[PDB]
Amino acid sequence: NENIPLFINNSKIQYDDTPYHWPSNVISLTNSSEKAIMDYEITCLAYDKNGKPLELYWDAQNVAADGEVGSVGFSPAGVDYGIVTGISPVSPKSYSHTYRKMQQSPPQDIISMFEKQQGKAWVENWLKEWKQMEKEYAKQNAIAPGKNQNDAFLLFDKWKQSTGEHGVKYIISCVKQVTFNDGSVWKNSAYENWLKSFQGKEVSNSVLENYYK
Amino acid sequence: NENIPLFINNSKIQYDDTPYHWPSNVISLTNSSEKAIMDYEITCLAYDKNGKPLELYWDAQNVAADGEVGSVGFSPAGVDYGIVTGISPVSPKSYSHTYRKMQQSPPQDIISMFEKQQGKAWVENWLKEWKQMEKEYAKQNAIAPGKNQNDAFLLFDKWKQSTGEHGVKYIISCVKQVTFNDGSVWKNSAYENWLKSFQGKEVSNSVLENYYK
């Protein structure tokens, strides 16, 4: 048997405590393995209250009345960024989104493209040192063995701030892979089947309601 | 008058204590001020046995027999990276070189690379984080008030490992500017006259001999 090293306890829309009550997809995780987890890929799917699948702008940014995108607080002239007048897409609309822990860092496919580029010798050596430092920072920020934590991602699409209503009723998730601090990579052999069974498909309310029970 | 906050005690070639005895321009520096120094610009000129100026690949990297650049130790196939069989220029050849404690930015080649793959907003945030990160590091390792310290830089050009002689017999240096830990910048009003007085000009051995006494 294959024991999943990163346990998803739940994935749920939650709203913050401020008067603007911004929505986030909050994924409750537990590192059940004996190794620190330095990176992960976790795929989510979204459903309305009737079990129909939803296409989202999953990583859309908020827009403010003065056109500011992705800010929070107040503008210097006094415009309230807390009031979300619209959304600004980032990734294309899709039934699924894959969240990555080292999202702040460029993916390894992209770093590998940069290595293979023709350049000066000192430029390649600059990138090598940068790669390692990036890896060391991620190791210091790893999820420790046994740690429970929430990883939260703003989810503005289908939210109406004035009423607090969100078209998304259920989020179901699956770990695609994880990377441990020693560099080893665990891949979920059940992932492709899960994606094929669920992505863009209707799901019963009993399955959705009990998905994390 | 004007009193300098950063005093150069000496600049000379030193060799390390490995069987390859790689050379380094070692700059002995004293913070004569009352504030910690987080960054500097120091310009060096080089002169041969008879006080004639030398043009160097000041920041060139070492080449090994297999052709690797900037490497230390031993290759898998047993190539000795300590044997320096040539040099690989970085900056163009010049009478002068200006050394810095803190780097101003990532190489332009890499910034441009990154914006095409990550996008403009990603790069701007990345440059911001990178600047702060280098600034925090510079502040933690600043030269303390009153303290002397040696800062070393490899200097391969005009050097012959098989023989041990270095063509550079005198390095004469001058502070251009200094950055204190609060962000403020002091500029040396004497620097431009110094640079004009020396760069590309022959100078007597007696002047070179006694420059730091």
Please, could you describe this protein's structure?
The structure is a homodimer of 213-residue chains. By secondary structure, chain A is α+β, with helices and mostly antiparallel strands. Chain A folds into two domains: 6-101 and 144-208, no CATH class; 104-142. The first copy, chain A, has helices spanning 108-115, 121-140, 191-198, 205-209, and strands spanning 6-15, 23-31, 37-47, 53-54, 61-63, 86-88, 96-100, 148-154, 159-160, 165-166, 170-180, 185-187. In chain A, strands 3, 4, 7, 11 and 12 form a five-stranded antiparallel beta sheet that branches. The first copy, chain A, has a three-stranded antiparallel beta sheet with strand order 1-2-8, with no helix packed on it. Chain A has a two-stranded antiparallel ribbon with strand order 5-6. The interface between A and B is medium-sized, with 14 and 13 residues. It is classed as structural genomics, unknown function. Keywords: Alpha/Beta protein, Center for Structural Genomics of Infectious Diseases, unknown function. It forms a dimeric assembly. A 1.85A X-Ray Structure from Peptoclostridium difficile 630 of a Hypothetical Protein.
Summary of the model, kept short:
The PDB classes it as structural genomics, unknown function. Two copies of one chain form a homodimer. The first copy, chain A, has 213 residues and is an alpha+beta fold.
Structural class of chain A: alpha+beta
Assembly type of the chains comes to homodimer
Q: Bin the strand percentage of chain A.
A: 25-35%
**Helix share, percent of chain A:** 10-25%
Radius of gyration of chain A: 19 Å
Coarse shape of chain A: globular
